[PDB]
């Protein structure tokens, strides 16, 4: 008998629907992320950070410092051999 | 979600014309209702004068 009006009721609609939560989630997820690996600070030196940079990053990751640390125990007690026996 | 956004882009601009022109085409025919009164009285007159 009259004009019905659901073309323009998106005003208080855009809270209730389910991907609104994902939309408001990832507009918050996307702003403070650094763009392209920026602010990396790829070099730092504290007399042993170079040891981590050469040995303990994701790139090198080989067991050799263990080997070095193995030799460290080989370096340790054998000298104590020369202190004891 | 970009698609469901983009469907409703120019729609309110068109339904503020839909509304007006549709209700005008609804309610400019009570003219034809008061025309129908003039129709049916003349039809009754034609019926009784045919009986004459």
From Swiss-Prot, chain A:
Q: Which GO terms describe its biological process?
A: proton motive force-driven ATP synthesis; proton transmembrane transport
Q: Which UniProt keywords apply?
A: ATP synthesis, CF(0), Hydrogen ion transport, Ion transport, Membrane, Mitochondrion, Mitochondrion inner membrane, Transit peptide, Transport
Where does this protein chiefly localize? Answer: mitochondrion
The reply on keyword RNA-binding is: no
Cellular component terms (Gene Ontology): mitochondrial inner membrane; mitochondrion; proton-transporting ATP synthase complex
Instruction: Note the superkingdom of the native organism.
Output: Eukaryota
* Localization, UniProt: Mitochondrion; Mitochondrion inner membrane
Report whether Disulfide bond shows up as a keyword of the record.
no
Q: What does this protein do?
A: Mitochondrial membrane ATP synthase (F(1)F(0) ATP synthase or Complex V) produces ATP from ADP in the presence of a proton gradient across the membrane which is generated by electron transport complexes of the respiratory chain. F-type ATPases consist of two structural domains, F(1) - containing the extramembraneous catalytic core and F(0) - containing the membrane proton channel, linked together by a central stalk and a peripheral stalk. During catalysis, ATP synthesis in the catalytic domain of F(1) is coupled via a rotary mechanism of the central stalk subunits to proton translocation.
Further comment: Present with 14600 molecules/cell in log phase SD medium.
Q: What is the annotated quaternary arrangement, including any partners?
A: F-type ATPases have 2 components, CF(1) - the catalytic core - and CF(0) - the membrane proton channel. In yeast, the dimeric form of ATP synthase consists of 17 polypeptides: alpha, beta, gamma, delta, epsilon, 4 (B), 5 (OSCP), 6 (A), 8, 9 (C), d, E (Tim11), f, g, h, i/j and k.
Family note: Belongs to the ATPase F chain family.
| Protein's name in the database | ATP synthase subunit f, mitochondrial
- Identify the species of origin: Saccharomyces cerevisiae (strain ATCC 204508 / S288c)
Gene field: ATP17
Query: Covered residues of the complete protein?
Result: 7 to 91 of 101
Curated annotation (Swiss-Prot), chain B:
| Name of protein | ATP synthase subunit 4, mitochondrial
Q: Can you tell me which family this protein belongs to? A: Belongs to the eukaryotic ATPase B chain family.
The GO terms this record gives for MF are: proton transmembrane transporter activity
BP terms from Gene Ontology: protein-containing complex assembly; proton motive force-driven ATP synthesis
Q: Which GO terms describe its cellular component?
A: mitochondrial inner membrane; mitochondrion; proton-transporting ATP synthase complex
Q: Any idea which UniProt keywords this protein has?
A: CF(0), Hydrogen ion transport, Ion transport, Membrane, Mitochondrion, Mitochondrion inner membrane, Phosphoprotein, Transit peptide, Transport
Question: In which domain of life is the source organism classified?
Answer: Eukaryota
Q: Where is the protein found, in the record's own terms?
A: Mitochondrion; Mitochondrion inner membrane
- Phosphoserine modified-residue sites: 4
Which species? Saccharomyces cerevisiae (strain ATCC 204508 / S288c) (Baker's yeast)
Q: Report the gene name.
A: ATP4
Presence of keyword Lipid metabolism: no
Tell me the subunit arrangement.
F-type ATPases have 2 components, CF(1) - the catalytic core - and CF(0) - the membrane proton channel. In yeast, the dimeric form of ATP synthase consists of 17 polypeptides: alpha, beta, gamma, delta, epsilon, 4 (B), 5 (OSCP), 6 (A), 8, 9 (C), d, E (Tim11), f, g, h, i/j and k.
Keyword match Transit peptide: yes
Job of this protein: Mitochondrial membrane ATP synthase (F(1)F(0) ATP synthase or Complex V) produces ATP from ADP in the presence of a proton gradient across the membrane which is generated by electron transport complexes of the respiratory chain. F-type ATPases consist of two structural domains, F(1) - containing the extramembraneous catalytic core, and F(0) - containing the membrane proton channel, linked together by a central stalk and a peripheral stalk. During catalysis, ATP synthesis in the catalytic domain of F(1) is coupled via a rotary mechanism of the central stalk subunits to proton translocation.
Miscellaneous notes: Present with 12900 molecules/cell in log phase SD medium.
